Enzyme design. Structure first.
Site, short mmCIF file in Angstrom:
data_model
loop_
_atom_site.label_atom_id
_atom_site.label_comp_id
_atom_site.label_asym_id
_atom_site.label_seq_id
_atom_site.Cartn_x
_atom_site.Cartn_y
_atom_site.Cartn_z
N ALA A 63 102.29 -110.82 -39.65
CA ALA A 63 101.59 -109.95 -40.60
C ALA A 63 100.21 -110.50 -40.95
O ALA A 63 99.24 -109.76 -40.95
CB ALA A 63 102.42 -109.79 -41.87
N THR B 133 108.88 -104.65 -36.50
CA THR B 133 108.06 -103.45 -36.27
C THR B 133 108.29 -102.51 -35.10
O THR B 133 108.82 -102.87 -34.09
CB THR B 133 106.64 -103.96 -36.03
C1 LIG Z 1 108.36 -105.76 -37.36
C2 LIG Z 1 108.87 -105.59 -38.76
C3 LIG Z 1 108.97 -107.02 -36.88
O1 LIG Z 1 108.42 -108.02 -37.66
C4 LIG Z 1 106.78 -105.89 -37.37
O2 LIG Z 1 106.35 -106.62 -36.36
C5 LIG Z 1 106.11 -106.58 -38.58
C6 LIG Z 1 104.62 -106.25 -38.55
C7 LIG Z 1 103.89 -106.32 -39.71
C8 LIG Z 1 102.55 -106.05 -39.64
C9 LIG Z 1 101.74 -106.10 -40.75
C10 LIG Z 1 102.28 -106.43 -41.95
C11 LIG Z 1 103.62 -106.70 -42.02
C12 LIG Z 1 104.43 -106.65 -40.91
N1 LIG Z 1 106.13 -108.04 -38.48
C13 LIG Z 1 106.57 -108.83 -39.45
O3 LIG Z 1 106.99 -108.40 -40.49
C14 LIG Z 1 106.51 -110.33 -39.24
C15 LIG Z 1 107.52 -110.83 -38.22
C16 LIG Z 1 107.00 -111.95 -37.61
C17 LIG Z 1 106.97 -113.17 -38.23
C18 LIG Z 1 106.43 -114.26 -37.61
C19 LIG Z 1 105.90 -114.17 -36.36
O4 LIG Z 1 105.37 -115.21 -35.69
C20 LIG Z 1 104.64 -116.15 -36.44
C21 LIG Z 1 105.94 -112.96 -35.74
C22 LIG Z 1 106.48 -111.86 -36.36
N2 LIG Z 1 106.82 -110.99 -40.49
C23 LIG Z 1 105.98 -111.81 -41.09
O5 LIG Z 1 104.88 -112.07 -40.67
C24 LIG Z 1 106.48 -112.42 -42.37
C25 LIG Z 1 106.16 -111.51 -43.52
N3 LIG Z 1 105.79 -113.64 -42.66
C26 LIG Z 1 106.22 -114.79 -42.20
O6 LIG Z 1 107.20 -114.90 -41.51
C27 LIG Z 1 105.41 -115.98 -42.60
N4 LIG Z 1 105.36 -116.96 -41.53
C28 LIG Z 1 104.43 -116.49 -40.49
C29 LIG Z 1 104.19 -117.56 -39.44
O7 LIG Z 1 103.73 -118.74 -40.06
C30 LIG Z 1 104.60 -119.27 -41.06
C31 LIG Z 1 104.89 -118.22 -42.12
#
Ligand SMILES: *[C@@](C)(CO)[C@](*)(O)[C@H](Cc1ccccc1)NC(=O)[C@H](Cc1ccc(OC)cc1)NC(=O)[C@H](C)NC(=O)CN1CCOCC1
Ligand SMILES: *[C@@](C)(CO)[C@](*)(O)[C@H](Cc1ccccc1)NC(=O)[C@H](Cc1ccc(OC)cc1)NC(=O)[C@H](C)NC(=O)CN1CCOCC1
Ligand SMILES: *[C@@](C)(CO)[C@](*)(O)[C@H](Cc1ccccc1)NC(=O)[C@H](Cc1ccc(OC)cc1)NC(=O)[C@H](C)NC(=O)CN1CCOCC1
Ligand SMILES: *[C@@](C)(CO)[C@](*)(O)[C@H](Cc1ccccc1)NC(=O)[C@H](Cc1ccc(OC)cc1)NC(=O)[C@H](C)NC(=O)CN1CCOCC1
Ligand SMILES: [Mg+2]
Ligand SMILES: [Mg+2]
Ligand SMILES: [Mg+2]
Ligand SMILES: [Mg+2]
Ligand code: NA
EC number: 3.4.25.1
Lengths: 195, 222, 212, 196, 204, 222, 233, 196, 195
Positions: free
Chosen positions: C49, C1
């Site tokens: 997210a 993000t």
């Molecule tokens: C940019 C793209 C970098 O990620 C943004 O931060 C984005 C923000 C965002 C906000 C709302 C909806 C979607 C996206 N973040 C992500 O896309 C995020 C990256 C991330 C993953 C894990 C983190 O720590 C736990 C921190 C940041 N991606 C996700 O959340 C993805 C979709 N989901 C997962 O990785 C699922 N994981 C989360 C942690 O627990 C286990 C499963």
């Protein structure tokens, strides 16, 4: 070490390099020149591991100077950059690799064109209109994506560079004690004393 | 991988599947795991793909030079000895698990070599990820005094067990028959029971669909 | 993000990207990273997210309960502090949230609060949050003035996200713009980077690093 | 593995099971763990199949070269060559070897070489994972100057129990008889030994 | 610190009717930071084309190495190297560094000048040859490319059709990978003419 | 140490039309390199014209589906047999998943149905509850293979109008159920070729205002 | 968090036209030591279900007690305990599957792999698997441990899909099971010759066979095998 | 430890060595590993001395309370109480217990409870570090319905070998005889058993 | 967080506190006030772990304010410092301790004396003429050992403080974006706006 920038404009290459030398919780020096002249129309800035940086820079400098004396001829910036890349490409698979990132700014007298090469410690070479090493790039690249034009003058390039230093001084965590700026063009290498 | 070797009346037969993996992905759907060391000595390889190929070529090269030096047809035990001493020297770091077979002036032979340099002897052998599926079939249907046609069937059946039941094995069945007094016949894609069905649709795009920025002729000549 | 929000003469600009990542896998290009809490309150999302999505929706429920109980819209300060006090309770457990609570009230005026998962809560005029925050800062800081017009401010916010979407590998998709005034928030559309980049490159003459 | 070597009146007998394991999977159920290093000098191999194999091959080479220059080597000499390899490469080997041979002067002899590379000359020797379960049985039942038939029964009964309790041991019981008469190979199948 | 996914990039090759195509993206970065949008990963030695993905320093090193080797081949053999032979040279050179490998994923593409047959091949970092009738994929978005190629591809495509298929395979695969994209190049190769096209793709 | 998670493989896929929606998934269940079942369904009719699949770790997937099915049941009891809308079900599932944020359900979840305007709807979830409505989504082991294909063929990404100089995009349009099923079948056959955890069979659940229909197709068993 | 001590190996099973067959050897291993030889790992529940268990034996004995207690509890205030409201295989399975998943979720699993074989009240064949992770699946053939690797390939040659079940007789199905048990004795280092086999038929009911042995074994070819390569003698 | 319990015609006999080790040091060379949980229900303890001691004390308490309410408990009941403690606290215990007792209805009975907490009813049982060396000997020599004198000799000879090979076992051989006649304690010193 | 200083002079206590709030490679804010007024004549500066600092400062502030309302009386600086120390002394043996270091500057109205207390996150309290937390002390303590006198005025104290900030700006590696200075005396607490 830390901040080294490079901007290629119409008729010159401009290299900015931070003056701070920090060890631990003490800034040991605030007037350090992180560059070496490899040949009259080729300048190399450097940043990385303590000791490795200068040791590598001076080693390259000696080799290029040796070539110049032997052939009575200046190597092209492209040729020097390829030599430097190969030395780092050897280094990375050595017992103890040089942890040094460099920018090579040069003016090719045969082509009458400025050239900027960015090479990391792995030996990853790229020719660029503007370049940076370390955390600096995370600010300057996007800034230059916006404000840079390929047909700019040296004076326009310096103003563009001031815009980078200002942004870095605002958002960077560490005090890097300003920069030493140097210009590489058809007339050789000179230092801007008031920046 | 899934590889086998079976002895019969007047010789020996080896077989293999044709799948190559990189994680859960199939890298090659029709790879060649049957290797020629000499004209009548063939090797089936499982494990690290490049290692099985390289180690088999190296020993095959040295066997050819040895055959020329001695003015004799090479022996399976010579290939076995050279392979196991090479593999042992590298303490298992060359991950080649081989089934060595062939006919020579001494007779017909069947061996297996592990990556660490240990060798076995047998009438029926199986190596690789699908070796348990294959060995289950071999243990169920093998018998003494097999004919050529019975051995090819047993071998390909053992490979099929691996193809269907093991995820590390798939696609086709390669066979190589080495009979005494005859030329060795390499049966590439002896069975092909995994042909892709007709696709439901043609994804041929209308010409001009892809946006282009530049065009240029490349010079390949001098 | 990459998310930003800055204060200026004509209110608050808020701009975000729309990419979601799962390592180097691009999980989505069409994600909503702004939550409309009420007609005068916005919330940006950055980090996990699920944590962002879940707790900021929960924040909206708490803000609704406030105006039911107190017969008055919640302040930006109080709204941000509910969220910061919540994540502080979970401190150490592994929540990952980089948030900006932006809005207008009579007593406060236009206000922005940065709130993150390690308990930091800061009031300020300019913030950029996310993996591409630095890229956005570079463009935003070098062009920012208080006296920007609503038209210019909207563009600078859009251009700052574009800059980050380009350089940051973990940012992109499309730009979602918002403008917060004394009358509330106003949505200024979704802008796909697939078209916006080339449109900006041509019209602005920038992005000379790219092969035109 | 379960392996043993027993001296008796007319010479010495080597014995072994036929199971080779890669974990709990039996890679080979008809293995030949009794290996010839010279006409009437054999060894029982336990430990790493690759290591014991490489060692036995080198020893066979040394004793072949010894025979070419100095004539038939003693069983003690054979054990010394095994030891030298096992001791000097102890950091890189996992080999437990029993050496047994027949001279006409010295009759039957047994030398055991454990992991460290030490040498121990004994009347009889047991080794391998399955040997732990028959220390008690073998000590109580072994006698010096047994007959061939008594020694075969001793080994058969002993390895039968070792196989019964050890999962790493099984298959057939191979034996090799070393006397002045010559070399005799014996084999015994599960249906016989299991119901002893 | 996984050498194969620091810089990023992809390469794909396809066969058609009396033609081959090889394509690559233009990105070079340092993890999240995009650094260059001009970093081409396809090279050629005579009529034999080579694409290389992986660690960029090794990509550059191997190009220089195979240029070196093919130049000496030509001087001694008095002819250009053929794709089948070059493929073997690549395998040899990679396995020479078996226990200290080049972190790359090369792809050979070209037409045999004698037989006229189209030829493509792929390798792992240690030299294992992966020959194919249809297509070869390599890079950080190899999974994506496998899924696009395996569905979009059909045999005996004409050069102008093959261009569309390979370009769409690369573009849509690259857009689902963070470390790939930032521009793209496609080579269409016929028996005695080669066209190189730069694709317009999204720059994020 | 005890590892409470496992990987049962497989892959799923949801596509939405104008007045319908499909949710497909292969019927293969695996652990490591072994096949557990060639037909073990993981796409379920949960009532109220909602279909659901939770792919990844089967034990967690079955538990989640079981809990959601039970959630639908109690929604009826507590709210006068009201129909659970697809948007309301999505939000409910977020809370089910996030309730175990610090000991997650190792599954990628997809639900499909019709929205309150009668139009087709697909919602997808991460393992801890983040969700988003989309026209298209693949989930599971082969999601990386399938998803970019759907971007191209369902949302017409990177496809421009011929002769427009890459200036005009191919216009978006809904697909017929017949066209969608073609894409599903081609998606899964392609995925089966290059992913070892995908194969055996394909089960599709189609959702219209008339209810839930099923379709089954064989896949390669290697 | 556990580690298994005394363990039981493969449990194999398959469906046939009228019912199901299940089998498991009578060994209780203590690592490499083949410690206990009189262990019954097939446990009947009523006259229509058999539960085959592998893995930790202490946890198996615990499950025995649960099933034993389940029969007792079902009989309480139930006049149709031996008729309409008797325990079904599907009831017994779901109970165990619930327990197994609850225990893994508390990070204190029952270190087992379980197959519940039986026949439902409507004549339908029941065969389903569950393990320490709470993972469940059903198939025409099911097996645990080494059985999954060696038995399933053999049993799937008989019943490769659903349509092959009506075509398979009890004579053919039992023959395949007994063959599979022999193959496991050849190749599994933690297996025994002695085993138990159970058939649950919709017509003839539950037939529990004890003290079976693996027989008709091929060992003769061993006599011809020498050394590991070059050894002629 | 080396411990065992053997059923015979008139009842059951428990047997054990007397060595307690803290590393290679013998903390107690005259230990009594045979412990009474009830009049004619005894147990052999192997593993952690502290754990097996605490368990036996709790079991003795349970069976004393059982006797107060329901009269004399069965040997099976005693084993069930041992199991319940060993199984439910398997993560925190290192106890290998053999339970042996004499009923008038059921005569002699032996139950072994290994580390896991499983129960196994057997004709005879062996346990402890030194038991590994006598699996072969005990299997070959055990017979059902032995006499008292035969059973004493069986245990004496068995533990003699276990003690001979196991360094963790030694000292005296204690035995406890459980019959309808009553309870008899026996002891055997090194000078006797060593030279068997 | 990072730099917090304190100097007790003749008639007042002066607290200096850095304005930078950095996270990662970005200075998020350059005007942060790292202090809370506990009572009219008592001020507490703080530095340490993100979130913990403000959460702790405001918690103490609430408790002191509650006491003031209850008793209609201001607690002495000594009493407040003892209360704060005990809270940190509890904290350190908690499941998750407050990682916060504080300086408490106050003017005791009963004694007519300024008082400076330095308390670390362990609950280690000391009364001092001058104090600092973090790496700052490694420069300022020796500097103040030399230049400090006990009978200095507030103006002399500010010049002495300028001397510290100058030294820190010269030798500290990080840019801490200057300081907010506050004076505590008989008339209460006031902020110096031009520093
Ligand atoms: C940019 C793209 C970098 O990620 C943004 O931060 C984005 C923000 C965002 C906000 C709302 C909806 C979607 C996206 N973040 C992500 O896309 C995020 C990256 C991330 C993953 C894990 C983190 O720590 C736990 C921190 C940041 N991606 C996700 O959340 C993805 C979709 N989901 C997962 O990785 C699922 N994981 C989360 C942690 O627990 C286990 C499963
Ligand atoms: C079956 C398919 C194994 O799954 C066979 O053994 C097969 C054998 C084979 C032989 C000749 C030609 C093709 C195939 N093996 C593989 O395909 C093999 C699987 C494997 C991967 C990694 C291993 O060690 C970590 C061991 C086995 N695949 C490969 O060798 C592929 C082509 N190469 C790589 O994955 C790259 N390796 C190089 C060595 O170091 C680790 C990465
Ligand atoms: C019994 C089984 C245990 O001691 C025997 O010693 C037996 C002896 C034997 C077997 C075959 C031929 C001659 C003699 N040993 C084995 O079968 C042996 C078990 C073993 C392996 C490795 C060891 O330490 C390095 C010790 C014992 N099996 C093997 O060597 C098999 C062929 N290979 C592997 O297990 C592969 N190994 C290589 C070494 O590293 C671990 C994986
Ligand atoms: C033989 C000697 C070894 O197996 C017996 O099992 C014997 C049993 C016995 C001893 C006395 C009375 C009744 C029964 N066990 C011991 O002598 C025992 C050895 C042992 C120690 C720790 C173990 O794991 C927890 C298992 C076996 N010795 C002791 O308990 C002595 C008194 N104490 C220690 O060694 C101190 N231990 C405490 C636990 O952890 C390590 C050090
Ligand atoms: Mg670089
Ligand atoms: Mg990007
Ligand atoms: Mg398969
Ligand atoms: Mg002793
Ligand atoms: Na990220």
């Amino acid at each position: 070490m830390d901040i080294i920038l490079g901007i290629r404009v119409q008729d010159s290459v401009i290299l900015a390099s931070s003056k701070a030398v920090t060890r631990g919780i003490s800034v040991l020096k605030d007037s350090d020149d992180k560059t070496r002249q490899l040949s009259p129309h080729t300048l190399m800035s450097f940043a990385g591991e303590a000791g490795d940086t200068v040791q590598f820079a001076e080693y390259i400098q000696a080799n290029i100077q040796l070539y110049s004396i032997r052939e009575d001829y200046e190597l092209s910036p492209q040729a020097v950059s390829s030599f430097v890349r190969q030395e780092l490409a050897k280094s990375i698979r050595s017992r103890r690799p040089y942890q040094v990132n460099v920018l090579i700014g040069g003016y090719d007298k045969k082509k009458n064109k400025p050239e900027l090469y960015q090479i990391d410690y792995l030996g990853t070479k790229v020719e660029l209109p503007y370049g940076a090493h370390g955390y600096s790039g995370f600010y300057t690249f996007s800034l230059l994506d916006h404000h840079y034009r390929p047909d700019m003058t040296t004076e326009e390039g310096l103003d563009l560079l001031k815009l980078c230093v200002q942004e870095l001084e605002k958002r960077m965590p560490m005090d890097f004690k300003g920069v030493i700026v140097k210009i590489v063009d058809k007339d050789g290498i000179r230092q801007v004393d008031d920046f | 991988t899934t590889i086998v070797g079976v002895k019969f009346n007047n010789g020996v037969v080896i077989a293999a599947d044709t799948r190559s993996t990189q994680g859960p992905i199939v890298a090659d759907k029709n790879c060649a795991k049957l290797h020629r060391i000499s004209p009548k000595i063939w090797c089936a390889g499982a494990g690290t793909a490049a290692d099985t190929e390289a180690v088999t070529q190296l020993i095959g090269s040295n066997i050819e030079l040895h055959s020329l030096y001695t003015s004799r047809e090479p022996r399976v035990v010579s290939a076995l000895q050279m392979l196991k001493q090479h593999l042992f020297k590298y303490q298992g770091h060359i991950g080649a698990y081989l089934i060595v077979a062939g006919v020579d002036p001494t007779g017909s032979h069947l061996f297996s070599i592990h990556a660490h340099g240990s060798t076995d002897v047998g009438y029926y052998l199986s190596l690789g990820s699908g070796s348990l599926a294959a060995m289950a079939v071999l243990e169920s249907h093998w018998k003494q005094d097999l004919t050529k046609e019975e051995a090819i069937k047993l071998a390909s059946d053992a490979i099929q067990a691996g193809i269907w039941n093991d995820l590390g094995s798939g696609s086709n069945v390669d066979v190589c028959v080495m009979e005494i007094g005859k030329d060795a016949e390499y049966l590439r894609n002896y069975l092909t029971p995994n042909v892709r069905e007709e696709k439901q649709k043609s994804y041929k795009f209308p010409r001009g669909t892809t946006a282009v920025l530049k065009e240029s002729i490349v010079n390949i000549c001098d | 993000t990459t998310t930003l929000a800055f204060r200026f003469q004509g209110g608050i600009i808020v701009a975000v990207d729309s990419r979601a990542t799962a390592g180097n896998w691009v999980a989505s290009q069409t994600v909503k990273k702004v939550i409309e809490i009420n007609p005068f309150l916005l919330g940006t999302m950055a980090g996990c997210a699920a944590d962002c999505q879940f707790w900021e929706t929960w924040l909206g429920s708490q803000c609704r309960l406030h105006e039911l109980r107190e017969k008055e819209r919640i302040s930006v300060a109080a709204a941000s502090k509910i969220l910061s006090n919540l994540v502080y309770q979970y401190k150490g457990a592994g929540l990952s949230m980089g948030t900006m609570i932006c809005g207008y009230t009579r007593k406060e005026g236009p206000t922005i609060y940065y709130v993150d998962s390690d308990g930091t809560r800061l009031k300020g005029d300019i913030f950029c949050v996310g993996s591409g925050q630095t890229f956005a800062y570079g463009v935003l800081d070098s062009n920012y003035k208080w006296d920007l017009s609503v038209e210019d401010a909207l563009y600078l916010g859009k251009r700052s996200i574009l800059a980050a979407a380009h350089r940051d590998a973990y940012s992109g998709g499309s730009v979602n713009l918002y403008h917060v005034t004394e009358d509330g928030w106003i949505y200024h559309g979704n802008h796909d980077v697939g078209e916006l980049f080339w449109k900006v490159k041509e019209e602005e003459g920038s992005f000379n690093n790219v092969i035109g | 593995t379960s392996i043993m070597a027993v001296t008796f009146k007319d010479g010495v007998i080597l014995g072994a099971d036929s199971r080779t394991t890669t974990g709990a999977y039996i890679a080979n159920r008809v293995t030949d763990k009794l290996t010839r290093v010279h006409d009437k000098i054999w060894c029982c191999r336990s430990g790493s199949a690759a290591d014991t194999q490489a060692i036995a091959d080198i020893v066979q080479y040394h004793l072949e070269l010894y025979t070419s220059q100095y004539g038939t080597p003693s069983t003690e000499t054979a054990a010394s060559v095994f030891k030298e390899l096992c001791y000097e490469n102890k950091d890189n080997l996992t080999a437990g070897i029993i050496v047994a041979g027949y001279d006409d002067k010295n009759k039957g002899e047994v030398y055991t070489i454990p992991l460290g590379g030490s040498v121990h000359k004994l009347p009889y020797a047991i080794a391998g994972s399955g040997s732990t379960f028959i220390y008690g049985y073998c000590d109580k039942n072994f006698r010096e100057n047994m007959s061939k038939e008594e020694t075969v029964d001793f080994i058969k009964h002993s390895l039968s129990q070792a196989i019964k309790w050890d999962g790493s041991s099984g298959g057939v019981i191979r034996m090799v008889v070393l006397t002045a008469a010559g070399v005799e190979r014996l084999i015994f199948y599960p249906d016989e030994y299991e119901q002893l | 610190s996984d050498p194969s996914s620091i810089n990023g990039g992809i390469v794909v090759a396809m066969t058609g009717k009396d033609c081959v195509a090889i394509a690559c993206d233009l990105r070079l970065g340092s993890q999240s930071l995009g650094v260059s949008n001009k970093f081409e990963k396809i090279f050629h030695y005579g009529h034999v084309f080579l694409g290389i993905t992986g660690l960029a320093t090794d990509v550059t090193t191997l190009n220089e190495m195979f240029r070196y080797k093919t130049n000496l081949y030509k001087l001694k053999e008095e002819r250009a190297i053929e794709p089948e032979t070059f493929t073997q040279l690549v395998s040899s050179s990679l396995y020479e560094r078996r226990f200290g490998p080049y972190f790359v994923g090369p792809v050979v593409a070209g037409i045999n000048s004698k037989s006229g047959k189209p030829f493509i091949a792929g390798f792992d970092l240690i030299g294992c040859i992966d020959e194919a009738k249809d297509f070869i994929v390599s890079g950080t978005a190899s999974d994506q490319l496998f899924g696009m190629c395996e569905s979009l591809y059909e045999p005996n495509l004409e050069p102008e059709d093959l261009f569309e298929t390979i370009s769409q395979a690369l573009l849509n695969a690259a857009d689902r990978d963070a470390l790939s994209g930032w521009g793209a190049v496609v080579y269409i190769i016929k028996k005695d003419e080669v066209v190189k096209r730069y694709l317009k793709m999204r720059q994020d | 140490q005890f590892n409470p998670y496992g990987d049962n493989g497989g892959t799923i896929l949801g596509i939405a039309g104008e007045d319908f929606a499909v949710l497909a998934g292969d019927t293969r269940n695996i652990t490591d390199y072994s096949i557990n079942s060639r037909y073990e369904p993981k796409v379920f009719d949960c009532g109220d014209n909602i279909v659901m699949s939770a792919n990844g770790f089967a034990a967690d997937g079955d538990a989640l589906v079981k809990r959601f099915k039970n959630s639908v049941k109690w929604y009826h009891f507590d709210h006068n047999d009201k129909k659970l809308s697809i948007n309301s079900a999505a939000r409910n599932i977020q809370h089910l998943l996030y309730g175990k944020r610090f000991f997650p359900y190792y599954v990628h979840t997809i639900i499909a149905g019709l929205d309150e305007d009668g139009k087709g709807a697909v919602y997808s979830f991460d393992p801890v509850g983040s969700y988003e409505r989309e026209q298209c989504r693949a989930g599971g082991a082969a999601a990386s293979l399938i998803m970019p294909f759907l971007d191209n063929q369902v949302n017409f990404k990177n496809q421009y109008e011929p002769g427009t100089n890459g200036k005009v995009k191919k216009p978006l349009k809904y697909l017929s159920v017949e066209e969608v099923i073609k894409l599903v079948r081609d998606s899964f056959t392609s995925a089966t070729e290059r992913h070892i955890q995908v194969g055996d069979g394909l089960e599709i659940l189609i959702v219209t205002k008339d209810g839930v229909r099923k379709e089954f197709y064989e896949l390669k068993r290697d | 968090t556990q580690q298994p001590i005394v363990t039981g190996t493969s449990v194999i099973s398959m469906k046939y036209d009228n019912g199901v067959i299940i089998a498991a050897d009578n060994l209780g291993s203590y690592g490499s030591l083949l410690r206990f030889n009189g262990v019954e790992r097939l446990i009947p529940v009523g006259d229509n279900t058999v539960v085959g268990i592998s893995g930790d034996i202490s946890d198996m004995q615990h499950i025995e007690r649960l099933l034993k207690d389940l029969v007792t509890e079902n009989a309480y205030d139930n006049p149709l305990a031996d008729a309409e409201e008797a325990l079904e295989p599907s009831y017994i399975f779901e109970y165990l599957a619930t327990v197994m998943y609850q225990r893994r979720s508390k990070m204190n699993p029952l270190w087992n792999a379980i197959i519940v074989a039986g026949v439902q009240s409507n004549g339908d064949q029941f065969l389903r698997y569950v393990n320490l992770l709470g993972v469940t699946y059903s198939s025409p053939t099911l097996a645990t441990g080494f059985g999954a690797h060696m038995a399933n390939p053999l049993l799937r040659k008989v019943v490769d899909r659903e349509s092959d079940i009506p075509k398979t007789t009890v004579q053919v199905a039992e023959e395949a099971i007994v063959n599979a048990m022999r193959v496991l004795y050849y190749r599994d280092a933690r297996s025994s010759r002695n085993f138990s086999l159970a058939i649950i038929d919709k017509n003839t009911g539950l037939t529990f066979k004890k003290n079976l042995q693996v027989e008709n074994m091929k060992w003769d070819f061993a006599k011809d095998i020498k050394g590991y390569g070059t050894q002629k003698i």
